[PDB]
C-alpha cells in the first residue's frame, strides 16, 4: 500500500502535480493529478531513468527501460516501463490526468520511486513514427517539465 507524488516544474509555464497509489505489491498503479501551461493537444508523458535534476530535465537520462524494449504506447507489451503515453491538454491548457498502469510499480524492480516524471512539448507517437527515433523516444520533443517521484504519506 504505497503512495508517491511528483511536483513538475520547468523553465517555462508548464507545471503540475501527479499522484501515484499502489494498494498491492505487483498491483496496478493509479496515476492522477493535473498539469497546466500546456499547448492544447497531446503531450508525451514518461518516467525517465534517473532522478537527477542537476542539469534540469536533461539530466534525467533516457526513458526508464530496465527490460531493454523498444519505445511503445502504454497499452502495448513492447514498451518501456516508463512509457505512459500522452496526456491531453484542453483549450485552457489544463491536462487532467487519470490513468492506471500495471507495468510501472512503486516497489520491486520496476520501481519508479526516485526516478523522474517528464511531460514533453510534442505528442508521443507511441513507437509508430516509422523511424528509429520513434522506437526510442516516440518523437515527443523537448522536456517541458519534470519532477522527482517521491514517497508520500
Amino acid at each position: 500500500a504505497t503512495k508517491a507524488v511528483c511536483v513538475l516544474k520547468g523553465d517555462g509555464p508548464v507545471q503540475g502535480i501527479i499522484n501515484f497509489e499502489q494498494k498491492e505489491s505487483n498491483g496496478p498503479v493509479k496515476v492522477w493529478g493535473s498539469i497546466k501551461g500546456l499547448t492544447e493537444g497531446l503531450h508525451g508523458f514518461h518516467v525517465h531513468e534517473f532522478g537527477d535534476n542537476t542539469a534540469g530535465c536533461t539530466s534525467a537520462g533516457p526513458h526508464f527501460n530496465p527490460l531493454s524494449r523498444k519505445h511503445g504506447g502504454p497499452k502495448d507489451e513492447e514498451r518501456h516501463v516508463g512509457d505512459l503515453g500522452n496526456v491531453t491538454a484542453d483549450k485552457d491548457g489544463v491536462a487532467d490526468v487519470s490513468i492506471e498502469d500495471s507495468v510501472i510499480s512503486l516497489s520491486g524492480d520496476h520501481c519508479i520511486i526516485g526516478r523522474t516524471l517528464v511531460v514533453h512539448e510534442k505528442a508521443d507517437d507511441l513507437g509508430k513514427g516509422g523511424n528509429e527515433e520513434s522506437t526510442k523516444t516516440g518523437n515527443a520533443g523537448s522536456r517541458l517539465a519534470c519532477g522527482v517521484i517521491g514517497i508520500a504519506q
Epitope: 494498494k23 505487483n26 498491483g27 496496478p28 502504454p74 497499452k75 502495448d76 507489451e77 503515453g85 491531453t88 487532467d96 487519470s98 490513468i99 492506471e100 498502469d101 500495471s102 507495468v103
Partner: nanobody
Amino acid sequence: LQESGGGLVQAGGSLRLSCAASGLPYRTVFMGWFRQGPGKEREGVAVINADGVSTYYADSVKGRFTISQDKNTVYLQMNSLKPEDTAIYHCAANHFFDYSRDPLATAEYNYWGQGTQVTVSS
C-alpha cells in the same frame, strides 16, 4: 484468456460465463466481456477493474447482468436473457487504461479470448 460457460438457454433464463487469465505478462487493469451478435459490430458488455468493485455495464444489459471477480477469474452472471443477447461473447483485458477513454470500447483492450457462443431461444 481462457473462457468457460456459455451455450443455449431459453428466454428469461440465466447463464454464467467465466474467464480466467493465465500466463499474462502483467496484472490486468480492466478485464471483461464483449459480444458480437449475428451481423453486428462487437460491443462492450461489462468490465471490472482490478479492485474487484468498480464496474461498467452497457446500457442494454444494466440490471440483468452482473460481472464479479475471484483465482483472477471474472464471472458474468446473465439473468433475464432475451433473444437479442444471442452472440459470440469474448473475454478481454488490458494492463493499462486511461480513464479519459471509454471502458467499454474495443480499442482499449488488446488481450482477447477465443470466444464463446451464447444462444437464447424464443
